[PDB]
Amino acid sequence: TKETVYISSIALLKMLKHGRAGVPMEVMGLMLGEFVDDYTVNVVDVFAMPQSGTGVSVEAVDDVFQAKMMDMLKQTGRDQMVVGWYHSHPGFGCWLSSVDVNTQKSFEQLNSRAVAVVVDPIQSVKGKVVIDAFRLIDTGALINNLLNKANIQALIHGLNRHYYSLNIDYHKTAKETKMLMNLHYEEKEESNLAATKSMVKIAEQYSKRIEEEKELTEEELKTRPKKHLSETADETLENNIVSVLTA
Amino acid sequence: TLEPSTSITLAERQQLAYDLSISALLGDKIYNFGELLHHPIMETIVNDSNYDWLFQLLNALTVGDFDKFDSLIKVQISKIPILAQHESFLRQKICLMTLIETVFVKNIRMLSFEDISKATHLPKDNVEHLVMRAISLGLLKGSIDQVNELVTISWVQPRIISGDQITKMKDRLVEWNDQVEKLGKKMEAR
Amino acid sequence: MVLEATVLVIDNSEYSRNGDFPRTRFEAQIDSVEFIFQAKRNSNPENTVGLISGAGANPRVLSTFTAEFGKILAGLHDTQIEGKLHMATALQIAQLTLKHRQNKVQHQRIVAFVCSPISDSRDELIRLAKTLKKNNVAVDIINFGEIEQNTELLDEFIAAVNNPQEETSHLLTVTPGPRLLYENIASSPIILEEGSS
Amino acid sequence: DKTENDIKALQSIGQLIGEVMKELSEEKYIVKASSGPRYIVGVRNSVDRSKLKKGVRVTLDITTLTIMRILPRETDPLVYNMTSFEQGEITFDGIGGLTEQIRELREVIELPLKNPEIFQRVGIKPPKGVLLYGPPGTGKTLLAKAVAATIGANFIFSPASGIVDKYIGESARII
Amino acid sequence: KRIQSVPLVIGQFLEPIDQNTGIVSSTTGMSYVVRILSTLDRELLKPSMSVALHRHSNALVDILPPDSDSSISVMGENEKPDVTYA
Amino acid sequence: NDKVRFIKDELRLLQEPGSYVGEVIKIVSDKKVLVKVQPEGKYIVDVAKDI
Amino acid sequence: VGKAAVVKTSSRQTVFLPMVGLVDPDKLKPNDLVGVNKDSYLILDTLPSEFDSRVKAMEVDE
Amino acid sequence: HEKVTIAPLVLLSALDHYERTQTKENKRCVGVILGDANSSTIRVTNSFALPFEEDEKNSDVWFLDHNYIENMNEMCKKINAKEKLIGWYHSGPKLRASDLKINELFKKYTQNNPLLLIVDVKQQGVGLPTDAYVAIEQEKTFLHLPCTIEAEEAEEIGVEHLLRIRLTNQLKSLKGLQSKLKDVVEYLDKVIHTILGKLQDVFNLNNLQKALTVKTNDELMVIYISNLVRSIIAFDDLIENKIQNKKIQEQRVKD
């Protein structure tokens, strides 16, 4: 059946911070949260494990580290359980490969619904973040999942454990939401500072923009392209208005 | 440092105070008699017996009488060659601070030769030489325009120790707030 | 005694870096911590102890709850050995430290050394005796050298906090003359009535 | 256990060589991979940018194509066409009776190493070239080895028909 | 603009076929007809400018300054000649 | 509205592997052209249905 | 520093690898076949002597 | 310049801290901030909650875990090497006296003057609501440092991915004046020092500016005349666009 993973703001941000910094080597960690029914996987928090260059392998997931960190998590009142793991690949897309699969599989034998989350931070500069969520065949509710229906019964009967993607939603919190927007009195000080110093220097700023303008007029004469000539004039006009406004 | 802790024995206050009084008269190094009011050299210890000189120093500086300067000093402090020049320096600084506050009420800093000549009780020519020595030091950061006979002054004054100044400040703070408020209103509108 | 999480409060007053004991009062104190830890630890396989300073330079938690003796000792030896005891606060902070405890089956207990004289308000000291019961916690005072020049506030604190002594409190009053401090502490009830001494 | 450790190196990835052509920016680089192509590649944090200043040979990821580490600069060194014989096989007492030629070669090759100083004070440049002609292995080859030996100089033999190979830019690189 | 992204092969733009179309010459000698980004134009590009093209998708992502010089075929640019005519 | 759609169309467009430049050796009558392609060897291809 | 060895594999590509203990540095040298992996680029084993062509034609009469 | 750059992750982790520790009734919650600040530019790159327990009639009673700072820092080291101790964070909303005693604790374990970052969590301030302070000698006293956002190219796109001048500047200024006024009225009640000295100074340095604004106007008037020309150059490109359109339109009708 249909599965929907809510990844939180503070999780996104820890995954992306770590994964960008590890580059070109991969970083993986455990996702913390709770499983609810068969339709909701909450990722509330996330921490990093040690780094891997080998593609993440079964020898490599620190048994000590996860146990030791959780015991400390416990005293700061983080008590909700591991729901899966996230892993980076920079350079390779947002997918699995067989090593991840073997990693993944071992987690699921422990849990039963675990998710693999893959971030590619090379595709997190496509001006969206590409992120995916995966699970192997694992059944016990996924028995209505991969004119039909002969196929999937035989698909889980011929082979248990084959990847599939999962859907993504982001649920967040209003205080988190307001914090994200108040990024963009220190504020007052800065805008004003530039305004002041712009006004000091304007005697020169005046001269260079007549010269640019003089050029622009001349180009258009020869020309008798158009977009470029317009844009150059538009920038000069924009700047003047802002400059009159400043005093 | 002394008065909160370390060496709060009366002996140590009394020697240090005596040194403070002698040095203030010899010097002109840091402001006038405000420094003496704020910290004690006549009210952790005696008000008399060479701390009499302090109260008289306050009367002499404001008034600017040479005779009151002559009478306050007793033989130990007086014999020293150093003090007398530095007496004139302290008198200008205090007098200058009084005229300037008076005129200052928005941004006025223009004081004539005539105001300063009067204050010191010296003719203009003595004052011309005297101010010229005092600007050298940088106790004045205005400038003297000889043939206008006006001194156009760029602030140098410390403006500190309040009681009079606070009443006036409060009046000013309110006025400024109103001026700004109208600007703000216009922006709000469009 | 019973299954208990103990915050141990050690007194490093100006007294303590000089003789009042053989050779040094600081050097009497160190032998007893080891003995109190072992006395408890040998009774039951669950038992944790934490270490805090009073006298020294303000109350500091030196060591959190642990079941390894080396940490306590390591923490004890990093002390500032002079100051004055911040009694009221030391009890309050210790009670605050206790809530975090490693296991939650355990009782909640403060074992304090008082070496140096105190000067606390009696009214307040009673409010503490039963704020320990706002949170149901116990306390044991190891007193010496206070009984040679000052009052025992501390008995009244023992009588006030008081509930049955399987649940709550002991007053262990040790004559301060020469003889190893741990042995003395043993003939006071804290290394008697134990499972394994 | 050494063998088990050897299996452990095999689990770590390959890593390709390129040479920095030029710094395009301090975050972006032009490198010409030694697999042929030229690429725009990035950097990682661990490395420094002063250790990427051009003509350095650098180590590239396999498919990530970012600079993972930098090895010392080289042009990838030869021992099969830059073929080395430390010292010679004969000394100049082993071939005495070519005397005049011995004396002249001594003074032209050994002597500028030992004192530049005399040639500088005068202000004339130092000798830079020697030519041998004659039929080869009558004494000619003998001289050339014998000189290398005494100086300790490294003899570097070039075969002329190793310096022609049939690919883009190899002939240029060897010399 | 954002979607293509790094890492990239270097090419030289041969000629504009039209609006949003170019024939490009890759510098492994192999010439391709590609799309160009709509954020780069006929007057933001020239017949021998250096361009950044995608490795597998071959479309003009970003414009490079020409500053690549071969170094195993040896093309020298030389700041500082230090000899004069005396 | 058209300007939004147009960008969208380009975004899709750009995900092609590209075209090869080739040289016509000869036209034939069979609807094939023999092309010596410059990145690769020589190929016989079937021209478009539009010409 | 590292035990750096460069090999140039017959696909015309150079790689920088470490030396594994499954070869000796006394078996690394030009004019020798060495067996380097296709995909981790690490010299697994050393192969029979003499690189490339072992004389392109010789008639042998034993 | 002396500067602090603060990750969104830091402040959202603080946002989470305050709820996740159930700290209520305007009590203190404490954690550690981590980054690189060996230099005089603080880069704050990571953070963690620290167990903290306060008493309800004493804030000079505190319980703070020393071992945790030390132990978690070692785990931090094993994960990334950018994530060193530089300071701590508190939920504000003001400074406290008790802030010093905790600050004194962190001083041993830092390699710069310990940074106290006050993160307001109520989100009822203006702008970036966080103010950054560093303990130095005056007793000991906290001093404001400029606190600004951070960027990493992935992180900033992700911040936007989740979410998808003059009037403000001026409003915030009047807001300031108003606050300055409030403080003065409060001081006047208290009286019947630094502040006063500052107020007098400001005053000395609208009035003084008046005369100079007159000179500015003549230069501004030249700038307005420049504007006039600029509109005309732009107007030329617009006109061209209309002709091209016209030609197309006429051709369209014909066919």
Short mmCIF file of C-alpha atoms in Angstrom, two decimals, chain C residues 58-64 89 92-93 95-100 124 131, chain H residues 51-55 57-58 60-67 101 104-105:
data_model
loop_
_atom_site.label_atom_id
_atom_site.label_comp_id
_atom_site.label_asym_id
_atom_site.label_seq_id
_atom_site.Cartn_x
_atom_site.Cartn_y
_atom_site.Cartn_z
CA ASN C 58 31.19 27.21 44.02
CA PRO C 59 29.24 23.89 43.70
CA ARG C 60 30.36 21.98 40.62
CA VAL C 61 29.29 18.54 39.46
CA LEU C 62 32.72 16.86 39.11
CA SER C 63 31.40 13.43 37.97
CA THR C 64 28.02 12.14 36.86
CA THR C 89 23.14 24.96 47.43
CA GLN C 92 19.81 21.54 46.27
CA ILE C 93 21.98 20.90 43.31
CA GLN C 95 18.85 16.74 44.43
CA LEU C 96 18.69 18.24 40.98
CA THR C 97 21.52 15.93 39.76
CA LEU C 98 19.66 12.92 41.24
CA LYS C 99 16.71 13.20 38.87
CA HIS C 100 18.86 12.33 35.86
CA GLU C 124 15.46 27.03 55.53
CA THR C 131 11.88 19.37 49.70
CA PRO H 51 20.78 18.20 29.99
CA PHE H 52 19.79 21.13 32.10
CA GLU H 53 17.67 21.33 35.31
CA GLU H 54 16.73 24.59 37.16
CA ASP H 55 15.02 25.14 40.46
CA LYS H 57 12.78 29.65 43.21
CA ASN H 58 16.58 29.77 42.52
CA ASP H 60 21.74 30.25 40.82
CA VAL H 61 20.88 26.61 41.46
CA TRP H 62 21.49 24.92 38.27
CA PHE H 63 22.38 21.41 37.12
CA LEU H 64 24.48 21.22 34.12
CA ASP H 65 26.41 18.20 32.91
CA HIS H 66 30.14 18.78 32.56
CA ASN H 67 30.93 15.21 31.46
CA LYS H 101 28.67 31.21 36.29
CA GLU H 104 32.87 30.52 33.57
CA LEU H 105 32.31 26.82 33.20
#
